[PDB]
């Protein structure tokens, strides 16, 4: 797991934990005043940046898996959304998903269908239409090296 | 069962029967002539000797094998003093190596003399002769026994017929102690 | 023989090590069933635009533009931060600057990234390549499986373990294709003594002679029966496994040209066997199962390529130390060592006179260096 | 991790394909591997050779002393007892002189008869092959070899002697050099110091094959210059790099 | 019927077996403070091992007898001094000392 990227993600989630529940107003205010996304281009090297973004998306989606409050869930999901929609990077990556994670987000969509989270629903719909989800069995790669 | 290749024991541990038995016989004769079996159980010495023979027949493969491992592989109840008998026999073998010229230059030890055990039994007669020139007894007796059987001071002072009655009274139980014992054992 | 009864979901069994048993064909079928796909075509966009999305939302749950019109404007790039990443309270930027300083210390320009560029090019080789024939287009939802392989012992047992290549395979394709695609050095290896006839072309390489090969996944023995010269070592394997009650249950035997990756019952992260040429064994570790995507290789003819071509050091000629060795000599007096190695010119000029006569007695064999594929 | 998935290693059966591979002669890269030699390994080799020589020298003497002891214990004559005692003392003095000989001559000449397999399987536990031990003792573990580096007065003489002889026999070339070294080290230093054969002046016939390599087996920006050299005989790494990197 | 209640043992090699001659005793050694309080109990009672074993629950009467014989064979002057000195039988304070010794052995086990 990426240490500094995990630290940044957890700090942003802690801030979302005090922001409004689900409304995108506080997300816009953050993206405006704090701009959590800073280390994306800098002056780094090809594979360094590639693995940076890869582990970023992988861990940010792995953190979507456990149950938390709506604040944390919205925060993680739309941090991922922003990081994918600002992909000024050239190679293909896609967010690393799990098999049953798709059914989990399907139940989440079925709940939004009766919940008033229209902005969240629309953003997630756009993310789905953008073909950003890549699913596997594990949120990372594993072998028997241990 | 180290004679026929069974499923459990691989072929590496399997050795020849005649040669291993002859080596064990030579080793137990060495133990009987070096005062190792006298006063001790013979079967532990037999086990130690056959184990040393099995290791000397092929030191490379089974240099790491232990006594408990060999007992487990052979399905034989490990004797308790077998380890001590092995430690003493290997010490005698180290003495024989010190007697021999090339080995005392090699400066072997209780783990590297197993490959030359065979050579030690080639001319073990003169080697054991010189080893006794320079008696095997328990470790508790070879710790520099300077005062062997100290002479106790003879004390035949008998007095006239007794000493006094103060000791009789100090042996007799007081009424307080009698009552206390009765209360305790009530 | 039917597959092991188990749920399609790969429920975990060991923490961060591997999951339980499951099927692959049913896995992919349920994967395609639980969604519609129809997105692996790269037809997003290269005029009336509002009415189309209005009709789309009309079928969607909201049927209104109140939130969409604001969110599409919010989620833009014109309001996004080239510029030096500084002048802001951050955490990872400290590590970034420390890495930049460590780079400016010794790393010179943009290079020394051998494995990095290797991975880059091996990943780009599969980006948007179209098939030569229209009938070779990979259908949507095809299972792609990543499979690491550990054949060789010649590597760093210390460096966290990384001996050999990793491959990608398609579900609907047969396992024989993977068998033939595994690039083993033992297949190029050649046997026979050629000291008296060094100029004789080595014929009937091990690949053609020892056609025996078989996979082993969860007690299932897949033996190749495509060629009339393939033996069955699984016979002796089963004989050994059944001659004694060692706790191993009965194992099933099947053909390799009739069972595909879909029909397999595997465990992601669990080691399986691929044994050929008698003792040439590969530890197969199927790590990931994923569907096809328009960014991946859409050509079924070379979806299986390679993704981790581990670098290997070639054995240099012991005499000149300038060319890679091609012959191995044993019991050679003129050779400096016993496991010796010579190249063509050095071997010719050392072991033979001006006319080509065999100078001295020795045993020479064609040394197929492991670094022959790369 | 492990490389024994199917056959753990307790009862691995040697199958027909395995025995055929073993009996044909296909030794791919397993037994031909070489491991660097260690200082304690050198010490063990020297000690084992010295002990083997001393034991092979003393065993006949020990058997003769045993025969003399048997004659003493079996012959009841007194006149021959004096001769037996004199011969026993002579054998004792022989053993004494053998043990008193310094530790410089009991190592053996450069090419002497020994029991390499015996010494290996007794001391080295089979880790070192008998042939490897033989070579190491014949050309790298002798006290008569000149450990001093080449004093810039051997390369030219070696190349001249090789031109005179025909470049066919390292042993004769080294014997004619006469610097009391092993031919292996002489040829090694000579071929490390000398110039390449200089095949040709960069004709495009080889550059086109290099381009074919760059098109078939090159990955990204790094170029396997050793894969290049394997086919492009008569070249060297630094020059090929500097030249092919440009133009 | 035995529903997999016990596990078969692959013991008793039909070939041969040897003897042990030592089965049960496996006593436990004493300590300095324990020897001190044992000498105190001797001076307070005498040689009657029944009362000594009754007042010592955690040590066996056979072990106490072995210890007394060992002291008679090795340290005679100490036994003589113990018999010379005398103390009236204390019960409550002796139980308190027993609790103290229990706490001490508990601390030892903790160490």
């Amino acid at each position: 797991t990426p240490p500094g990227l995990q630290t940044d993600c957890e700090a942003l989630l802690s801030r979302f934990q005090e922001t409004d529940s689900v409304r995108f107003e506080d997300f816009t205010e953050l993206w405006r005043n704090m701009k959590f996304g800073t280390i994306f281009c800098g002056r780094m090297r090809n594979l360094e940046k590639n693995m940076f973004t890869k582990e970023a998306l992988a861990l940010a989606w792995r953190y979507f898996l456990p149950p938390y409050t709506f604040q944390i869930r919205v925060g993680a999901l739309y941090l991922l959304y922003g990081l994918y929609n600002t992909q000024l990077c050239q190679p293909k990556q896609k967010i690393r998903v799990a098999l049953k994670d798709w059914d989990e987000v399907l139940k989440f969509q079925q709940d939004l269908v009766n919940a008033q989270h229209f902005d969240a629903a629309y953003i997630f719909r756009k993310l789905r239409l953008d073909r950003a989800f890549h699913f596997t069995a594990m949120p990372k790669l594993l072998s028997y090296r241990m | 069962k180290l004679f026929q290749a069974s499923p459990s024991v691989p072929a590496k541990y399997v050795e020849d029967k005649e040669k291993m038995l002859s080596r064990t016989m030579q080793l137990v004769e060495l133990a009987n002539e070096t005062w190792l079996v006298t006063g001790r159980h013979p079967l532990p010495v037999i086990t130690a000797a056959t184990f040393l023979a099995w290791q000397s027949l092929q030191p490379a493969d089974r240099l790491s094998c232990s006594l408990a491992r060999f007992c487990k592989l052979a399905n034989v109840d490990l004797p308790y003093p077998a380890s001590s008998r092995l430690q003493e026999l290997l010490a005698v073998l180290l003495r024989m190596a010190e007697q021999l010229a090339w080995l005392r230059v090699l400066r072997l030890d209780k783990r590297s003399v197993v490959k030359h055990i065979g050579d030690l039994l080639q001319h073990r007669q003169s080697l054991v002769r010189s080893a006794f020139r320079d008696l095997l007894l328990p470790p508790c007796m070879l710790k520099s026994p300077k005062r062997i059987c100290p002479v106790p001071p003879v004390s035949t002072v008998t007095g006239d017929e007794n000493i006094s009655d103060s000791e009789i009274e100090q042996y007799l139980r007081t009424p307080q102690e009698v009552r206390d014992f009765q209360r305790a054992q009530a | 023989v039917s597959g092991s009864g188990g749920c399609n979901f790969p429920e975990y069994e060991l923490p961060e090590l591997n999951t339980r048993a499951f099927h692959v064909g049913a896995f992919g079928e349920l994967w395609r069933g639980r969604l519609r796909g129809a997105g692996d075509l790269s037809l997003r966009e290269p005029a009336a635009d509002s009415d189309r999305e209005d009709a789309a939302v009309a079928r969607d749950l909201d049927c209104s533009l109140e939130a969409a019109a604001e969110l599409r404007a919010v989620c833009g790039l014109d309001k996004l931060k080239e510029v030096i990443p500084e002048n802001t309270d951050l955490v990872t930027l400290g590590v970034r600057k420390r890495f930049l300083e460590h780079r400016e210390e010794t790393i010179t320009i943009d290079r020394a990234c051998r494995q990095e560029t290797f991975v880059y090019e091996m990943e780009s080789h599969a980006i948007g390549k179209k098939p030569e024939n229209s009938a070779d287009m990979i259908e949507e939802g095809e299972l792609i499986l990543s499979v690491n392989i550990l054949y060789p012992v010649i590597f760093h047992k210390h460096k966290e373990h990384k001996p050999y290549q990793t491959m990608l395979v398609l579900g609907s394709q047969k396992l024989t294709q993977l068998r033939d695609s595994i690039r083993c050095v033992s297949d190029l290896q050649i046997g026979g003594e050629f000291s008296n006839t060094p100029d004789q072309a080595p014929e009937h390489i091990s690949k053609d002679l020892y056609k025996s090969a078989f996979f082993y996944f969860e007690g299932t023995f897949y033996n190749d029966k495509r060629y009339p010269e393939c033996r069955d070592l699984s016979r002796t394997i089963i004989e050994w496994s059944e001659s004694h009650d060692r706790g191993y249950g009965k194992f099933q035997t099947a053909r390799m040209e009739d069972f595909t990756f879909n029909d397999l019952c595997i465990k992601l992260g669990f080691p399986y066997l691929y044994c050929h040429q008698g003792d040439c064994e590969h530890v197969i570790v199927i790590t990931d199962i994923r569907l096809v995507h328009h960014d991946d290789c859409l050509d079924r003819t070379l979806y299986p390529l390679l993704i981790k071509k581990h670098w290997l050091w070639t054995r240099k000629c012991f005499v000149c130390k300038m060319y890679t060795a091609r012959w191995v000599t044993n019991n050679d007096s003129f050779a400096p060592e016993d496991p010796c190695f010579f190249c063509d010119v050095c071997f010719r000029m050392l072991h033979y006179d001006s006319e080509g006569n065999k100078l001295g007695e020795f045993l020479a064999y064609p040394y197929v260096d492991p670094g022959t594929f790369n | 991790p492990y490389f024994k998935d199917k056959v753990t290693g307790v009862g691995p059966p040697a199958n027909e394909d395995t025995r055929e591979k073993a009996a044909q002669g296909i030794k791919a890269f397993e037994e031909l591997l070489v491991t660097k030699w260690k200082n304690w390994e050198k010490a063990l080799l020297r000690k084992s050779v010295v002990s083997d020589r001393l034991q092979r020298l003393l065993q006949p003497k020990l058997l003769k002393l045993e025969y003399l002891h048997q004659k003493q214990s079996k012959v009841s004559s007194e006149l021959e007892r004096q001769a037996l005692e004199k011969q026993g003392r002579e054998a004792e003095k022989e053993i004494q002189d053998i043990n008193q000989l310094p530790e410089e001559a009991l190592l053996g000449n450069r090419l002497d008869s020994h029991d390499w397999e015996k010494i290996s399987n007794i001391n080295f536990e089979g880790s070192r092959s008998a042939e490897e031990i033989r070579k190491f003792w014949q050309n790298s573990e002798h006290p008569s070899i000149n450990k001093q580096e080449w004093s810039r007065e051997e390369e030219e003489r070696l190349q001249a002697i090789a031109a005179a002889h025909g470049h066919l026999e390292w042993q004769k070339i080294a014997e004619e050099l006469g610097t009391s070294r092993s031919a292996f080290q002489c040829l090694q230093k000579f071929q490390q110091h000398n110039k390449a054969l200089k095949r040709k002046e960069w004709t495009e016939e080889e550059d086109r094959m290099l381009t074919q390599l760059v098109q078939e087996m090159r990955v990204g920006s790094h170029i396997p210059y050793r894969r290049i050299v394997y086919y492009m005989e008569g070249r060297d790494s630094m020059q090929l790099i500097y030249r092919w990197t440009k133009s | 019927c035995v529903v997999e209640e016990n596990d078969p043992i692959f013991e008793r090699g039909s070939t041969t077996t040897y003897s042990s001659f030592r089965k049960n005793y496996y006593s436990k050694p004493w300590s300095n403070k324990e020897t001190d309080m044992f000498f105190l109990a001797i001076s307070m009672v005498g040689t009657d091992f029944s009362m000594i074993g009754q007042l010592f629950p955690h040590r066996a009467r056979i072990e106490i007898k072995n210890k007394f014989k060992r002291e008679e064979k090795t340290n005679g002057w100490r036994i003589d001094k113990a018999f010379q000195e005398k103390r009236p039988f204390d019960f409550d304070f002796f139980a308190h000392l027993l609790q103290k010794v229990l706490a001490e052995e508990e601390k030892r086990k903790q160490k």
Side-chain angles (χ1 to χ4, degrees), chain C residues 11 24 28 43 73 87 92 98 110 120 135 139 158 171 174 176 187 197-198 217 225 232 263 267 272 277 362 365 367:
Chain C
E11 55 272 346
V24 182
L43 198 66
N87 193 19
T92 308
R98 279 171 282 184
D110 204 339
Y120 158 82
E139 63 279 3
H158 140 75
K174 296 180 177 297
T176 60
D187 297 330
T197 59
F217 291 83
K225 254 67 180 296
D232 185 69
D263 302 330
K267 299 177 180 178
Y272 304 109
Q277 280 192 15
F362 59 91
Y365 305 88
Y367 173 82

Side-chain angles (χ1 to χ4, degrees), chain B residues 167-185:
Chain B
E167 295 181 356
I168 279 64
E169 292 186 0
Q170 91 190 356
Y171 279 144
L172 290 177
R173 192 178 299 179
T174 61
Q176 292 298 142
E177 186 176 0
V178 171
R179 286 183 286 274
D180 299 0
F181 170 83
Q182 290 179 0
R183 190 202 73 262
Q185 298 301 140

Side-chain angles (χ1 to χ4, degrees), chain A residues 9-137:
Chain A
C9 180
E10 292 183 1
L12 188 61
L13 288 176
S14 301
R15 294 177 180 273
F16 284 142
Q17 191 176 12
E18 53 172 305
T19 62
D20 291 1
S21 60
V22 296
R23 280 289 85 90
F24 72 99
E25 298 285 73
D26 294 13
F27 283 72
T28 61
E29 105 186 358
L30 265 292
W31 185 255
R32 182 93 291 97
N33 59 22
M34 200 180 74
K35 316 183 75 60
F36 48 83
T38 59
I39 168 163
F40 177 78
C41 180
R43 33 244 54 192
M44 210 160 56
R45 306 202 165 184
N46 300 330
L47 191 91
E48 294 186 1
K49 169 184 168 187
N50 186 19
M51 298 300 299
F52 182 98
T53 305
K54 211 78 70 173
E55 299 178 357
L57 300 176
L59 184 59
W61 187 273
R62 188 226 67 85
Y63 219 104
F64 191 48
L65 282 139
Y68 299 112
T69 63
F70 291 104
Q71 291 176 318
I72 301 297
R73 303 175 82 85
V74 180
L77 173 53
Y78 298 115
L79 167 62
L80 273 165
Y81 175 87
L83 293 175
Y84 177 87
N85 286 257
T86 61
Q87 209 55 245
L88 323 155
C89 107
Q90 350 96 54
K92 27 115 230 24
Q93 343 260 108
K94 274 72 88 296
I95 311 179
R96 206 166 181 88
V97 189
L99 198 281
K100 50 258 180 65
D101 193 330
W102 193 261
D103 184 70
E104 201 287 334
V105 299
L106 176 57
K107 296 300 300 303
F108 182 68
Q109 282 285 75
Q110 294 292 113
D111 191 316
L112 299 193
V113 165
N114 52 268
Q116 63 183 140
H117 308 160
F118 300 104
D119 56 357
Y122 173 79
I123 301 165
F124 187 69
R125 198 185 309 170
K126 180 61 175 296
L127 188 58
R128 287 182 62 267
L129 290 167
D130 207 336
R131 290 288 83 87
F133 299 145
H134 165 263
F135 352 88
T136 63

Side-chain angles (χ1 to χ4, degrees), chain C residues 24-29 31-32 138-145 169-173 261-262 289-292 303:
Chain C
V24 182
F27 196 100
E29 289 174 1
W31 207 342
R32 293 197 302 270
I138 295 174
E139 63 279 3
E140 300 178 356
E142 174 66 355
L143 285 167
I144 296 174
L145 299 85
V169 296
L170 295 176
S172 62
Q173 291 193 148
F261 306 94
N262 300 330
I289 298 172
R290 64 197 193 87
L291 300 180
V292 67
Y303 181 79

